[PDB]
Design a protein around this motif. Sequence first.
Motif, short mmCIF file in Angstrom:
data_model
loop_
_atom_site.label_atom_id
_atom_site.label_comp_id
_atom_site.label_asym_id
_atom_site.label_seq_id
_atom_site.Cartn_x
_atom_site.Cartn_y
_atom_site.Cartn_z
N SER A 1 29.76 34.71 49.78
CA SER A 1 29.34 36.01 50.27
C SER A 1 28.04 36.44 49.59
O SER A 1 27.80 36.13 48.42
CB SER A 1 30.41 37.07 50.01
N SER A 2 27.21 37.16 50.33
CA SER A 2 25.98 37.75 49.80
C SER A 2 25.65 38.99 50.61
O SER A 2 25.91 39.05 51.81
CB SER A 2 24.81 36.76 49.83
N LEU A 3 25.07 39.99 49.95
CA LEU A 3 24.63 41.17 50.69
C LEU A 3 23.44 40.89 51.59
O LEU A 3 23.13 41.71 52.46
CB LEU A 3 24.26 42.30 49.73
N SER A 4 22.76 39.76 51.40
CA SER A 4 21.53 39.47 52.12
C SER A 4 21.73 38.60 53.35
O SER A 4 20.76 38.37 54.09
CB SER A 4 20.53 38.80 51.17
N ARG B 1 22.04 38.39 58.29
CA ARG B 1 22.69 39.68 58.47
C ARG B 1 22.62 40.16 59.91
O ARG B 1 23.60 40.71 60.43
CB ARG B 1 22.07 40.72 57.53
N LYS C 1 15.83 33.04 51.07
CA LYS C 1 15.77 33.38 49.65
C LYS C 1 17.17 33.59 49.09
O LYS C 1 17.45 33.25 47.94
CB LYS C 1 14.92 34.64 49.46
N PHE D 1 25.91 42.33 43.39
CA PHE D 1 26.89 41.55 44.14
C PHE D 1 26.49 40.09 44.26
O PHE D 1 25.37 39.77 44.68
CB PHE D 1 27.04 42.18 45.54
N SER D 2 27.40 39.21 43.84
CA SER D 2 27.28 37.75 43.81
C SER D 2 26.26 37.23 42.81
O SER D 2 25.88 36.06 42.86
CB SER D 2 26.98 37.17 45.20
N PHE E 1 32.05 39.82 43.14
CA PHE E 1 32.18 40.22 44.54
C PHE E 1 32.86 41.58 44.67
O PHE E 1 33.47 41.88 45.71
CB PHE E 1 32.93 39.14 45.32
N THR F 1 15.49 45.58 52.62
CA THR F 1 16.38 45.97 53.70
C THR F 1 17.84 46.07 53.27
O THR F 1 18.69 46.42 54.09
CB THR F 1 16.26 44.99 54.88
N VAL F 2 18.16 45.78 52.01
CA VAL F 2 19.52 45.93 51.49
C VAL F 2 19.61 47.26 50.76
O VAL F 2 20.46 48.10 51.07
CB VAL F 2 19.90 44.77 50.55
N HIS G 1 14.13 42.71 48.38
CA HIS G 1 15.31 42.94 47.55
C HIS G 1 15.47 41.87 46.48
O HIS G 1 15.77 42.18 45.32
CB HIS G 1 16.57 42.99 48.41
N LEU G 2 15.24 40.61 46.83
CA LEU G 2 15.48 39.54 45.87
C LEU G 2 14.30 39.31 44.92
O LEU G 2 14.24 38.27 44.26
CB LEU G 2 15.88 38.26 46.61
N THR H 1 14.45 34.07 41.27
CA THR H 1 13.70 33.47 42.36
C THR H 1 12.79 34.46 43.07
O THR H 1 12.20 34.10 44.10
CB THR H 1 14.66 32.83 43.37
#
Lengths: 260, 261
Positions: free
Chosen positions: A20-23, A76, A90, B50-51, B80, B173-174, B203-204, B209
């Motif tokens: 799972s990932s929010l992205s 998503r 990513k 998260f994660s 999670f 966008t998160v 976001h990342l 990375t």
Amino acid sequence: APAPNVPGGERVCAYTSGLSSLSYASARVTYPCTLSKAAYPATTLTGGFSNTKEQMTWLSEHLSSHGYIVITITPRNIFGAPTGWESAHKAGIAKLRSERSRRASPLYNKLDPSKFALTGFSMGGGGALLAAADLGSQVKVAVPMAPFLGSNNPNYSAITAKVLIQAGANDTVANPSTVASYYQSLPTGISRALTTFRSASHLDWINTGNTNRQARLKTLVTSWLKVYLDGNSDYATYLDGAEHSRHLAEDWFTRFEYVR
Amino acid sequence: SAPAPNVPGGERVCAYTSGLSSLSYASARVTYPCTLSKAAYPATTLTGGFSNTKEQMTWLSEHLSSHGYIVITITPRNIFGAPTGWESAHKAGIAKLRSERSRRASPLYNKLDPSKFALTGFSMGGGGALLAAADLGSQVKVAVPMAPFLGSNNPNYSAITAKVLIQAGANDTVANPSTVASYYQSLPTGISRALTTFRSASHLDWINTGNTNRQARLKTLVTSWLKVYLDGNSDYATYLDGAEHSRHLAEDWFTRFEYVR
């Protein structure tokens, strides 16, 4: 040197727990079941607009049969824009690095982060170009397949990965002329190739595509990964050696360009 | 004059994990300046979201420790989970730092200043930092929620006494920049606070990375905020509202910049 157009030696396992990932919406890792080598190269894999990860198993399970870890990802919003797949790519790289560190994961201490690729179809191939430009040297290879960028412009100047761009001669969604213009946007100092396949249509890059033609697609993708991720020169023959000559004698390509 | 905050600082960075076990998080790693010559060091927690695992946050922990910070970077009990799980991780980090300060065998024995504790966290860890800062009150001096994600958690913002820098990404966008800005708007009116929304950041960018050039901008603001408001080192104020900040405007670093000194 297992032939790159058919499954390789390794039996293929898969899991989804812990991905799972929010992205992105969902993901699935395929890998050689034994995992006996010290570290493994890896690639992300996505489809494009309206596609999900289940539609890309023709390629993911083929690559894992040749020794690659593949994380295949549903973004998503499957009805989004190419930046949505950029985030998915990513997030795939992030998840692989996370899984290398998660004691409960089957990939624990089994990934070579210096041998990561991004691979993507259509808007997922556009996302792969966008992410390759943003990640820079943190990804070694990108394989945009029938890429679709729409209005988006990657920072091509920043790409350091070795890039294989595939196109379809009959593709009316990702017109092979438009795909070629992405390839002619790449830095002159990177290894790169453009393979435009005769008779190929847009959907040859999902499960419903032509099986014979997909063997041609697999030949090039797998050999690009073997040469430029693993450094395995046994597969150079498929790029510019005797096997590439066989592809010419069979008229595989309407356009072919390769900078070693 | 003072070491530039966008690149490593003057200190060699050391690390340890022995003795850091807690029943409120899964694992932790302390980075610190190897020599520990000062009488007391400022400290911050650090989490991903998260994660995420602590291994993914070393771009920031090792940078900060090279600038003189003790950093305890934490993998939560449940990666999670929900933002209250990172709120727990942050409080566990503060409690562990208190414990280490008193532990004879610990590298940090009698080397922490409990009036200079901070919380720093990304995404759901940034939401956890806001939630923990409300519950911790004056126990933490600074909080840095980075692209925070609170979901339907509603912090008691009126209990926050820390000096809070909220970071956001214009392309995120998160953690949507408008939602993050709403968190900034909720901060109490009597605290020093700031909002930095970074042009072109996604976001990342706040994990290893992320884009390295944009991360240099992120480090600049995070480091400078801690220096001014955790350390009390006014030599870094230039990066917030002086000549260096004006360079940031010139280079169009921000889509949003708010700052109450």
